[PDB]
Amino acid sequence: EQHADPICNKPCKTHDDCSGAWFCQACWNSARTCGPYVG
Incomplete structure (x- = not known):
């Protein structure tokens, strides 16, 4: 997991904002926020 990400829940629409x-x-x-990259 790790998930020590600083963008999680940043409001945007695209992934590029993240x-x-x-x-x-x-x-x-x-959510309109920087969620996991699904993969």
């Missing part, structure tokens, strides 16, 4: 992220690299639909 550019510096490693875990919460994908901005989720309903």
